[PDB]
Subunit: 401 residues, 4 copies
């Protein structure tokens, strides 16, 4: 365990190996951690547990820190298995210990663990739990940030906000605090996390942050459930969330596609040339969905004012990976972004139109599509280049030079 | 080169390494070959070339076999790059040599190679090309089997049907003939090929095979563009195609899903138990789409009377890989198959309904869906098991015992 | 559960999803199963458990079959985590239940579970455990088949041999019995299993099978810990093992390599052509280690009379995947096989000699190496074909048509 | 094309899709680019070409820039296929055009292209080629930076150093210049490139840079063959190379391993905790070789003062991915680094000693090994932490807070 501050001890679990989250839908290329905290005042409080894969290690490590029977209260901010996975093994040892969680968390905890006989204490925003020595816990309901059961727990005096998923990131390091790690890696993982997980809930991010700030509670540290503890200028991640939540976009265009014989790839490259030579303010990234990190594509879409999506026609429909990526974008609910579909076809085409409709379904404001037959010759590539010019002009954030 | 028979020489290219066809949408786990043939009678005829990646080797090997200027005619059955990819390099050496192909092949050859000045000779079904010594080529148009430009070429006397893609398979072996290879591996690759490529065109398979047989041409060998030359009971692959084309199905049910915390996986296993214990005639295969070979899933769907598809709800939509796989199935146009959607959800669900609608869009006759909240307990698993029983009873090919 | 025979019930766990065994060193492409058996005579005996990943499922399912308190004896044939992984969870409920295992299994069970207070009973070959109704278990020690702790348990009367890993295979199917599954798929997984796991212990297979046969005990079924139960002609797998154990080899040559610019790949193909045109009886397989299933390469090596391994020189050493695969072959201890190293270099070479030396270290009888500079031109490729010709003549099993 | 400076035009090819270099031994996670330059003075000079995969594109684009007949001289700094791969296609159009290259480049060009009839001009350091308008090319031989054939070309007046691989990096972007791209991304690819490619030639980097600097030639730009053109403070990359070449190391320890049941992984984590609590100045990274980017592991090794490598014993040898990675490190010749081997075993062990020996063979100064049997219990993990503590004290760069 690690001292977070005073009587707050980190009793979580680092995960250098992990690479597949959400099945295989979130690649954790820098590992992750599962942060669990033990507060030792007059009362002893455990905040969250760890992923089920480390349940045995978690309960044994916890014994190294405290006699389990000495734990007074357990707080579950969030019952996803990566944080409450060890709960069944823990409760087998101390089954009478009360659990403090949201009403919705009873449904989610019971849904996974099947132990309704546990002693649940429903908490609502503003409820308090005294732990002695003049300190108390204050609970803050954060439904759909990102689960119905989500909440945060604030510890007065020490002024630590146990935010669970919010403001966390999948980043593994032997050091605990944000000022102790590589900042580039840290920000990259922070943005990757928000873009791929929290984008659809952005409309709830700002009001809740506003509400929390309206409590006028000081914040010395933000102890999340993944990654570093924010202790140095800790609200920096809060301000990022405020910016990221406001339908964030940079002067940036992401192009991604799938291709069978590189024809659609040739179009993507000509589009990018037309953009770069018409508006030099636009950052352009190109990804082949079959040969790229999907979560990186989505982070870039999150950062872009618009996207172009490419597919060849295969059996009158679109390339399956493109269909899958468009389905996922439909659930992420990107806002205020523009899109254009393109691709090569052999005869009757149709996939590009299909894709354009579904990009519209996903919430993109659609510009005209670009289609080419077989391999584009020099004349076809000029048309693709002019498409990039036209898109660059249409999507300019300000007058072009 | 290898003697196929008499004056027919194999001048193709084996590809032990290749694994990605159609981008990454067809995994060639046993490699492939690109079959090209050189007939040396009074005239010298080249049938097809090879994939563009071996163009240099192809033209050099060809020089080892014949003075290029001695090639009289070139036949292009099919202008996909894996067979006509070497054409530009060849025509750079002998640009006056005539090319015999379908009208549509002019569009597809020009579309890839950009050399309209080449000397094209459009052929239609029944056209002949004399090559001396009493032998002649007979051309057979096979549009949309599998491309608009597809055709076959028959060589009289030798009675060899140069079928190009039709009846081929992605299978690499140093030996040339079907009787010289492992039969299990051969059939597996044959069926994998038809299921993943030719299923949507099955309605065209039977009439064309009927038409060809109506020509009363004897067949000693079928020399395809991929894999073995059929010489021993060569029409065995034709009969398979007749069976595979007739909305083929065995008493078989395929279950595939994606899952984030194994809840949908637990449902899939309980469904399978209910099936196996209610109808012992049904073969059952289960695949996690994120951890399985996609082309194998589709071969099994091709072999099944019905499928169950599982997804958890992620941001109100389905798992992206499931959306992608359903998009692909929509283009393969499976016929006379039944389907049922299932999956686990945290609160409001919706993905299962979404998936069921899209499976209906893909052409499956839908049975009721199965939904469970969080991790199924013993009562929920019984419901999943009974779902398997009900499906097994509904989908029974005959009365159950 | 499933009735195996009389009062023997299968209470194991099927694993349709598993792909990675031995870390990632054994790919289970058709899943696997962890077979556990509950015998219900006068005494109730549990034979092995399941993989740790399903311990919670295993205990609950076992509860559905019997009150855990009514379990009299627990038999652990083998303490690897895929069979004893659920033991800690089970013993937490019935900590007084005796465990019967080899002396080495006490060290392996405690090594994983850390519960030496458990009630262990050491058994030696010939020891018996009466379970009533005239039936008894007879234990047979099989150390290093494949672990020091390994043993088999025989049930008189029912004449069922619980063999644990021996005679098993990684193959998942809803049906339990060998006569109910696809035979080629079954055989493929059986041979893949022996080749990649039991090859180095082949010298122990024959004597142990002879010893067991010497007991003159009837065998109606062989109940393994992975895959089907052998009930129809169960000796068939025992005969395969006798064949596979006698330094097995077919008239077959496996060629595998790694390459950076395909120069070594060109050599591999030319070698294969020289083999195929010199001895047509030889089956040849070629694999690029960087793009192939490693366990399939090793299965072919197991089936082969000799191998050719190729590597280019990279920084004066061999390519790492070749080094790694040669390391693994050194541990498998293939016997009575021949080998020849080859590859391309830019200047100093040396990696081929390095490889040839390590192939000798791994147990192969070495033929001359084959080297080429940069890309082999037509003259160099002839040398490669001639090398193939010379290898076929050297390694001919019969005098050469 | 893009204007680099004055009459220097970039006529290369961006590669957004590429992921596999050196076969698959170098993953280009941000793509790459193949930089070719066309200088248009009185004489027209082409500097290098592009990867063979884009030779057709390269020649056609080059046609769009200039009539190929007007190309006077072709300079080949380096004949690796990613730069000279389009040479055969280009020389088929202008076969009389002289090629300027090192003597070793004649052997490497002919080695790949097989056209010795081409008009080669051997150049040595200090040789000049006048191109008119008072400007001339000056050649600098850089053998084994990184190939025997490698050289650099300097253009007086414009003061542009065409460095080919040296100072380059695999990084694709629509913008050409270093001051126009993301800096952290740029740096990351630069260091990844040096660590995985140029480390073994570090002893040649400093003397060659000193020699070039001794020429007192102004350098306004460094035009490499991969990635950006260095125009803003171009010496910055030259200084990095001087630092990276001096047996570079930070206060950093890299731990990587492979594991079958996570026992060795548990040791790695405990070791890291012992390090972090003994010397907090040390950066620690931990990687599972079977689930990590190998090139990232090697970049960290390059940055590290020492490594710990872990393996379990499998069939008396080490796990193959560890053997392969140790083979690769032997060729990279890391200098002034320390190492310690560790891992878990079931009985006889031996793989740890084997690994320790080979880590010495690879150039690491070896500390004591660390071994554990089966899964480390609390007592064994303490030994692991203490091993970490002892390693940190041994390897401390400063006396230890
Ligand atoms: C398996 C397959 C199916 C195809 N189906 C269609 C189709 O349904 N409609 C169409 O217009 N073209 C179809 N084509 C042609 C491709 O769209 C055409 O080759 C296109 O130029 C490829 O683009 P790409 O290189 O970007 O993948 C198909 C091609 C293949 C290989
Ligand atoms: C990132 C994420 C998003 C989710 N979105 C929804 C949702 O939109 N609606 C819902 O009912 N459940 C949602 N859930 C809950 C899952 O559907 C629930 O955990 C389910 O039991 C998981 O099924 P599985 O283990 O088969 O993947 C979400 C879960 C995660 C991790
Ligand atoms: C990164 C790298 C390192 C190399 N190191 C050596 C070497 O140490 N000695 C040598 O003779 N050739 C070396 N070469 C040259 C290769 O061995 C040569 O290009 C060979 O023809 C490639 O064979 P392949 O295409 O089968 O991979 C090296 C090439 C590369 C790309
Ligand atoms: C296939 C296999 C082969 C093994 N061979 C040996 C061996 O030769 N010597 C030994 O001491 N242990 C051997 N073991 C035991 C492992 O070394 C032991 O289980 C170790 O604790 C696993 O470490 P890990 O979890 O880090 O992979 C073997 C285990 C397996 C699964």
């Amino acid at each position: 365990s690690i001292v977070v501050k005073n009587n707050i001890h980190w009793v979580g679990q680092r995960d250098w190996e992990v690479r597949d989250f959400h099945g295989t839908e979130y690649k954790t290329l820098r590992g992750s951690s599962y942060n669990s905290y033990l507060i030792r005042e007059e009362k002893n409080v455990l905040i969250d547990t760890v992923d089920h894969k480390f349940s045995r290690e978690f309960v044994q490590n916890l014994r190294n820190e405290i006699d389990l029977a000495d734990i007074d209260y357990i707080v579950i901010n969030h019952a996803e298995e990566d944080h409450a996975g060890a709960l069944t093994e823990l409760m087998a040892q101390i089954p009478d210990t009360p659990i403090y969680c949201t009403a919705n968390a009873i449904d989610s905890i019971n849904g996974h663990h099947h132990h309704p006989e546990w002693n649940f204490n429903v908490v609502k925003t503003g409820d308090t739990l005294d732990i002695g020595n003049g300190k108390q816990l204050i609970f803050v309901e954060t439904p759909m940030l990102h689960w119905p059961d989500s909440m945060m727990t604030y510890l007065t005096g020490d002024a630590v906000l146990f935010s669970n998923d919010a403001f966390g990131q999948h980043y593994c390091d032997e050091h605990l605090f944000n000022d102790e790690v590589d900042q580039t890696e840290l920000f990259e993982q922070c943005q990757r996390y928000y873009a791929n997980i929290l984008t659809p809930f952005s409309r709830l991010v700002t009001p809740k942050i506003t509400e929390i700030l309206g409590f006028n509670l000081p914040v010395d540290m933000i102890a999340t459930s993944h990654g570093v503890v924010w202790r140095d200028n800790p609200t920096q991640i809060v301000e990022l969330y405020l910016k990221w939540a406001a339908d964030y976009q940079e002067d940036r265009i992401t192009i991604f596609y799938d291709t069978m014989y590189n024809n659609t790839r040739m179009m993507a490259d000509a589009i990018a040339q037309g953009i770069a030579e018409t508006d030099p303010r636009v950052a352009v990234k190109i990804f082949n969905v079959a040969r790229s990190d999907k979560n990186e594509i989505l982070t870039n879409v999150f950062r872009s004012k618009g996207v172009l999506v490419g597919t060849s026609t295969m059996n009158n429909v679109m390339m399956p990976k493109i269909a899958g990526l468009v389905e996922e974008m439909t659930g992420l609910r990107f806002r205020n972004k523009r899109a254009s579909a393109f691709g090569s076809h052999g005869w009757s085409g149709g996939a590009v139109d299909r894709l354009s409709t579904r990009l519209q379904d996903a919430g993109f404001e659609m510009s005209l599509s670009l289609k080419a037959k077989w391999r584009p010759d020099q004349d076809a590539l000029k048309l693709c280049r002019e498409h990039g010019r036209e898109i660059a002009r249409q999507w300019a954030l300000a007058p072009l030079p």
